[PDB]
Design a protein around this ligand. Sequence first.
Ligand SMILES: CC(=O)N[C@@H]1[C@@H](O[C@@H]2O[C@H](CO)[C@H](O)[C@H](O)[C@H]2O)[C@@H](O)[C@@H](CO)O[C@H]1O
Ligand SMILES: [Ca+2]
Length: 226
Amino acid sequence: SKDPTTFPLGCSPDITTPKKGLSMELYSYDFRKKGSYPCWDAAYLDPNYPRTGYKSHRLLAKVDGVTGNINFYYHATKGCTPQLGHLPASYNYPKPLTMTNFTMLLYGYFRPKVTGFHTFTISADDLLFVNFGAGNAFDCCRRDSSADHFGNYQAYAIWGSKTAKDELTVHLDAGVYYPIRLFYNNREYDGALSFTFKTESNENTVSDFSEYFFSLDDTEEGCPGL
Ligand SMILES: CC(=O)N[C@@H]1[C@@H](O[C@@H]2O[C@H](CO)[C@H](O)[C@H](O)[C@H]2O)[C@@H](O)[C@@H](CO)O[C@H]1O
Ligand SMILES: [Ca+2]
């Protein structure tokens, strides 16, 4: 149920109009004390960090309606220094934040337009961990109760690996709502996130998620498929 799979389970909500976009939570991420070498904290790679550790830091912002092109590259100018900047407009959060050092959680549902094999390509500085599918990300219209219980990642990218890029090929059904969780961190300096996909049905890369990302209310019974 929770394991990654090429045939992720999806959801069938009883809702005539879903809400556009994913939800986002932003969290602080500190450097180690001055005189530390390296200056940055390796906590971001603690195995618990994407599940619980990120919540030991300050919740900075919680917003809805994240969609469009969510890709970014923040070029820092100084090492081992908090520097302010902005997320792209697509994130619905125009306040400044420490773009050199922060954590971001996105969640909601991906609804495909076509049926078939989708190949998602991701890259990140410093990390992007992706869950995708009911159970693997969270349970259908039962997100609040299953949010902390995601399974092993469907895809991940870590700066400093051999390549810092990953693919995920999954077969999806058009119009089905698939639970998705993105977890991002910048430890220091530059920060970057790339999230795009292709399908077998044409050669174009999709980078604008405007009619693909949705939010659904939880219900007592949930909204499983099949
Ligand atoms: C490996 C390392 O410590 N590099 C320093 C730079 O910081 C890293 O930058 C990479 C991207 O190149 C990445 O964002 C990583 O998260 C950062 O830790 C930077 O501080 C630079 C300043 O001149 O020095 C490098 O040594
Ligand atoms: Ca970085």
